[PDB]
Subunit: 312 residues, 5 copies
């Protein structure tokens, strides 16, 4: 029909609330996730008021095509939501209760500066456009905001799901808008990365470092170059999960430092052999004896400094 | 139309049953499977009752748009089911029979603690929301629960398909709900993993262990490091099927233990060569003679202990 | 409208036939293929009969919404077919001709026991459910079963497309059903597997076997271990096409036998070097001279026995 | 309505034409491409004729649901086209002009005998089925066949887009059909394959051939076996683009010849070392001196013969 | 209804404007991106004019099915846009305001000559077809062209979004068209390619170059051939992102030059060993001493020349 007339030019208030039923398919590369939830609306149309004692009923049921329903839209979705109407009810005073169940695909940026040990906030924006004869604003009904106890995200820990009460009001396309923000806080589960990636890589590194207790040039070359090939295959497996970012990240810095260490170890081996050939064995012995202690300490200090820089 | 009036404020009972026709596309990473089944409903509307001897017919056929049909929904599906109506029939006493065929995509968590030798239970939840003038509850009709003899899941053995008779009743969004649980028990087929993964890996391990019967440092390095590269490529192939979990699993523990063994073998080779160079051949001979027996026994004991810890 | 009345309680017969237009997207992992075909129906409604000489026309054309059309369904499809109606015509005696063009996705198990040289049969099932006032049965019209001369499946040779004349009658959900089976026989094209997989692998095997004409331990280790790495990469490429089965297959047995051969060759090399070091050169010479002949003959006999076991 | 009546039992002619707007997503494995084009129809209905000077208009506009429009279908598409109607106009004499814009997915076989330097023809078939009271035939209107100047296929050069004027008439399902063929000729862009695949492979081959200027058995084994591993990784990368064919192809023959060359080079190395050990150095020197020239000449002659066999 | 009548045979002008809300899924291989935006239209229908003081309202609201709306289409989209109507309003003078929100998939070529450091322009074309009784032309309304502050493309920097004011007028299918061009300028974020690809490759190159400070033929072969295997795996990882082009590109030229360098280094090693064996040590010493300086300088000069050729 037509939007409800004002009595003294007041804004119409619409009370919202979202109840989460499902959450799945969080994609890091595309920065998307799928949702399945309820949507609840409530407003007041004085034209719908009835007498209870006369009609003999306290509650009225309507079809969606018989009354005026405001148009509420999601802002950061790919296509329009797929929704069906659950129930419409009207109170004797005039207030109408609206409920529907929908599904949608949401777009939301992510931060990867602490990739294996990070936390993300996901947003859902709701907007409504005013009409030429009425002003509409949004409100939050805290009795209708929640989630199911069975909601699970594969690889994440859900912490909270709250709304910002204050809406943002502005002008878009020569018309006034009102916007609402729903937030969902999550935490990555990082247990499996330790014995899957971290410890095997340290094992390969320590296996490469055994070249400082040997004096055979050929076995030293084999050791180092083959451990480097294995490092490359590990890096290639790891880089498939992380997308490209315009800022430096923890894992990338670690990987670059590992390459740098392999380079310096090759240089040390080559210098040792060169000095040996040139009949200067004492100098090569002292250099390898120094390197034996120097490499792990500098590795440990580099790692401590990096962890303080990124997480402190 | 309108929900059937109560006679003395009693709850309306709706008898359900699901007959499985197809089951396919079980995805471990996304924890989803597709289904194709029948759905059967039965209730009583006294307003539909007729006389058999008068009309001259015992059974009445209606369209779906001519009578009141309760709204039944699936809880853990991605989008609403695609369904068509097969037949609607009404009995002379008032009972109506409903049948439809649907397709849907279901979400269900999985446990991977015994990944190659595990068993899964899959759930399907059915819910119905009460109306403002009547209370609706769900019941199970055991004469209409079953599956086809041609249902096949690629890589799984189907065991049973039963329902829990007792429904769960609660309040959601200031309205009463009733929920039903259907369970499907399956078992992985694990025959192919043995000669495909398990035995070749043991072959590579035993091939790496031949370095305790040799005294050549270069061939020992080649042997061990190349077998380690092959182990890495096997692990990389295997890790594509298992998703990330927040708990320890059998396969991951085995793989970590294999890396640990390779590390210790490199250390043994290096110690042997170092003692040989230093003119202490008896000590190196005794160490390699000890290691020859020590490695397989400790492997076997570790494996027995792990298998008792995970399956016992 | 309503199903055609019986004259003396006889079953209504419906004559079917499928004409294939397209066949594509045969997926081995998912055991599915896509189809595009005609569907032809024919039955008799005495209520439609007219006089030819009166109306002045011999053939009558109807819309699909103006007459009763039986409901025919496909049993092993994922979702309901997408179909449109081509023509409906009625004969003066009462017989009606029905034609439509559809598309669907079909599910059908496959056998992989002779994977590179196998043959498959694909099934399509058609079912019809009886109504409360009439019994319906299915028949096959052999004048309307065929395929186009341009039907092509990428990698397969189509042999025949026939129907089983006798239908299967049973009771489902307290109602009678009738089912029909359409079969399509195909054969894999195996020419490309020979110079793509088989011969290169034999080349690598023969290249590994050159270690019995050498007495250098390091080159022998390099030869064998590197050929084994190449075998692993070939196996990893091959295993992507075959899905997991619960029975043994020809290719898997060949691959396991190849691993076993590599293991035994490593053992032979190690024994040879060990005996040489221990100052027993005659025994090592005799062992390598024996192995030179022993390996290819045992390979050939194993292969003959396996081929007789699987194909004989 | 109803198909236009004949005057003296003549066939109705329908003039067609396709104007290409877009062409994208050419898939070699699945032998499919997507299209976006116009479709133009023209015929004569004497029942639509009007007087221009009376009505005061020269052109009449109708809705698609108000007149009879022939049913035109595409033969080698996966699903029915998605189309919308652009304009319908009628001439005072009776001729009607029809225009629509559609999108579709087309199936078309490809030939790969000259894979990097091949040319393909793509077909689009149009069919129409006669009715029980009229015969319909197809014609080509050369003033309405063309393509846009912005049509681009990623990796192909478009040459021409023409139609065969003569239609093919036959009987299908006891009814007459008429079929039309549209052809689109393309050519692969082969510039990038040279410095991406061809030249690096020749570099690896020439690097393997340096073993004829050396007398060290271990470095010769390392050289050859490692170059063979690199050849295998190149072949594995290349084989992902080409599908399986039942005939021999140029690239596959080249790859098989490369494997054969590696085999023969390993044999040469082994024979050389064997003769050296046996105290026959002159014979090994002469054999390696012969091989130095023999290998590249036989490679070049083999390549010339293959190129003449496939392209001549 | 019917298009608005001209007063003195003038063209109808339609004022357009696009406001960007979302931009995502830029695919390099397929040259596509997804968009979500507003669309604004404005024209004048004298038949809609009313009196404000009489009706007592200044603004009129219509349904989309009650008035004539011009047909506007996108030219380089895959399928027709998914759109819904937001508001329709009419001014007392006769001007009508139109707004809608749509989603579409756009096709647009890309240039890769400076792949890691390139900039792209993306186009969106709008067309309208004239009718048989009126001429329609397009105009640009600069007060309705813009984008949101939250628009983000994963891996790109958005610079501007403007329109070309002058439309292109021509004749298509014997009817006049008008076309408009919207442009969107972007820039790749290239920070992550440096420590991810560029520097590790230089490390491997410098590690291969250590063979000019050694006189052991076997370690030199191991060094060079293994670094070449690592280069091949890096190239294989990199080539998955770039599609095939018919012109030369910066990255491909760099990669080819790296292969050429590896070839020449193998040749140098082989010549050195050959001269050493032949008892000419001074000549081999001088050659390796020359190569030590010659290789990096020629690399640096080649790189400078290439960078000037492609970016200067
Ligand atoms: C030789 C063997 C070398 C093994 C050295 C192991 C050194 C590191 C082990 C411990 C690292 C963790 C530090 C403390 C972390 C902590 O407080 O726990 C929090 C955190 C919770 O993980 P979330 O994803 O948030 O929850 C999912 C699981 N509950 O728990 C962990 O980090 C657990 C880490 C256990 C890994 C132990 C390594 C496995 C193999 C050990 C081999 C020993 C022989
Ligand atoms: C040198 C060769 C070394 C070969 C050593 C083999 C050692 C292990 C072989 C047997 C392991 C199985 C123990 C018993 C298992 C059992 O009771 O059977 C149950 C189970 C059923 O599998 P499901 O997936 O549930 O059903 C699908 C197939 N029916 O069957 C098996 O596990 C069968 C295992 C057979 C594998 C034999 C290995 C193949 C090659 C052997 C080479 C011999 C030369
Ligand atoms: C810090 C994190 C790890 C750092 C990287 C370590 C790489 C691997 C190191 C290998 C050590 C090899 C030492 C070796 O070969 O020496 C044998 C050495 C020589 O001793 P003597 O002959 O009595 O000394 C005479 C002069 N006083 O004898 C031994 O057996 C020493 C003990 C070796 C076993 C324990 C070594 C543990 C190595 C790494 C553990 C980290 C986890
Ligand atoms: C040194 C070179 C070593 C080369 C040794 C080759 C030994 C095997 C070659 C022949 C194997 C086939 C046996 C007979 C098979 C037969 O009767 O043909 C049937 C069958 C039909 O294939 P379908 O997929 O059903 O149809 C598609 C193609 N028409 O044809 C074949 O199997 C053809 C096999 C030819 C392969 C020849 C190998 C290619 C390279 C040879 C190199 C010679 C130098
Ligand atoms: C437990 C599971 C497997 C454990 C890992 C095994 C790795 C491979 C082991 C290789 C054994 C090599 C032994 C070797 O080289 O010795 C040759 C040895 C020396 O004997 P004599 O000179 O007479 O002894 C003089 C002093 N009494 O002679 C032989 O031929 C022995 C027999 C060797 C063949 C059988 C070996 C089987 C090896 C593993 C089988 C597991 C499956
Ligand atoms: C040491 C360096 C060794 C380099 C040796 C190079 C030997 C081959 C180079 C030339 C091969 C081409 C023969 C003539 C081909 C011809 O006539 O051109 C047609 C054809 C057109 O390609 P289309 O896909 O149809 O169109 C897209 C591009 N216009 O052009 C080509 O084939 C161009 C080939 C150029 C490749 C040059 C190799 C690149 C690097 C050279 C390194 C030199 C130092
Ligand atoms: C069966 C299928 C293949 C089996 C696996 C074969 C692996 C490769 C075998 C390599 C053979 C190497 C032989 C070798 O080095 O010997 C050189 C040998 C020594 O002869 P004399 O010094 O005169 O003998 C003195 C004592 N009567 O001289 C030769 O040149 C022999 C001929 C070698 C070339 C032909 C070899 C063919 C090898 C495999 C072909 C299979 C395809
Ligand atoms: C031993 C270690 C060797 C390290 C040598 C490093 C040599 C190159 C480092 C600097 C290269 C960049 C030149 C100047 C570029 C410039 O002006 O900046 C623009 C540009 C902006 O990137 P956009 O994608 O447009 O924006 C996203 C990030 N803001 O910034 C860069 O290029 C930054 C480059 C920093 C890379 C530093 C390398 C990382 C590790 C260094 C190890 C040192 C120890
Ligand atoms: C045909 C296509 C390529 C074929 C495959 C080539 C593989 C690589 C070949 C390597 C050649 C190595 C030659 C070598 O080591 O010899 C050094 C040789 C010995 O000469 P003298 O001692 O004076 O001779 C005394 C007796 N008259 O001295 C040299 O420096 C010769 C020149 C070597 C550099 C040029 C070689 C080019 C090699 C391949 C180019 C193809 C592109
Ligand atoms: Cl929405
Ligand atoms: Cl549902
Ligand atoms: Cl169906
Ligand atoms: Cl079509
Ligand atoms: Cl459009």
């Amino acid at each position: 029909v037509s939007p409800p007339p004002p009595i003294a030019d007041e804004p119409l208030t619409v009370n919202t609330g979202i109840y989460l039923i499902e959450c799945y398919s969080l994609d890091d590369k595309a920065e998307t996730f799928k949702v399945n939830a309820f949507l609840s609306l409530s407003w007041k149309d004085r034209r719908l008021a009835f007498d209870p004692v006369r009609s003999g009923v306290r509650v009225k049921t309507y079809e969606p095509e018989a009354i005026w329903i405001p148009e509420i839209r999601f802002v950061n979705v790919e296509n329009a939501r797929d929704a069906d109407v659950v129930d419409i009810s009207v109170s004797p005073d005039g207030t109408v209760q609206y409920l529907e169940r929908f599904s949608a695909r949401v777009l939301s940026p992510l931060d990867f500066r602490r990739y294996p040990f990070d936390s993300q906030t996901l947003h859902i924006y709701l907007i409504v456009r005013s009409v030429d004869t009425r002003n509409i604003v949004l409100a939050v009904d805290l009795e209708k905001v929640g989630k199911n106890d069975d909601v699970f995200l594969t690889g994440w820990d859900i912490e909270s799901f709250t709304a910002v009460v204050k809406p943002a009001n502005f002008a878009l396309e020569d018309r006034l808008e009102s916007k609402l923000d729903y937030q969902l806080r999550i935490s990555r589960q990082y247990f499996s990365y330790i014995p899957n990636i971290i410890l095997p890589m340290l094992f390969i590194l320590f296996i490469s470092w055994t070249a400082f207790w040997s004096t055979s040039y050929e076995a030293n070359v084999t050791l180092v170059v083959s451990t480097l090939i294995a490092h490359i295959a590990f890096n290639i497996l790891v880089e498939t999960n992380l997308p490209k970012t315009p800022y430096m990240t923890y894992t990338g810095a670690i990987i670059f430092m590992i390459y740098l260490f392999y380079f310096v170890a090759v240089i040390e081996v080559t210098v040792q052999h060169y000095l040996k050939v040139e009949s200067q064995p004492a100098r090569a012995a002292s250099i390898t004896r120094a390197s034996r202690i120097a490499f792990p300490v500098v590795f440990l200090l580099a790692n401590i400094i990096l962890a303080f820089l990124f997480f402190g």
